[PDB]
Write a protein that binds this ligand. Structure first.
Ligand code: PNS
Length: 78
């Protein structure tokens, strides 16, 4: 389910960024809205890779700016 991948990703983000799940929305931008720094970003991409068993290249990661970007990436790639 969209809801299922959504719920998994929110937990990952919440834990990495110390932000309550309810504050995490599709257009939430990691750096502009959720206070992510450079190490946060590295930790998040590695956490997505570990959870969803996908490989996110450096250039892909540079295009994952929001929650929706990350969900759409995972749904594209399983
Ligand atoms: O603090 P920041 O978010 O800008 O950076 C965090 C990361 C992990 C991206 C870097 O600190 C990092 O480790 N970069 C590569 C490791 C090096 O030794 N780089 C050479 C100096 S730029």
């Amino acid at each position: 389910s969209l809801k299922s991948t959504f719920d998994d990703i929110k937990k990952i983000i919440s834990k990495q960024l110390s932000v309550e799940e309810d504050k995490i929305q599709m257009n939430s931008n990691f750096t502009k809205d959720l206070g992510a720094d450079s190490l946060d970003l590295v930790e998040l991409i590695m956490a997505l890779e570990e959870k969803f068993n996908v490989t996110i290249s450096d250039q892909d990661a540079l295009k994952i700016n929001t929650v929706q970007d990350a969900i759409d990436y995972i749904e594209k790639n399983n």
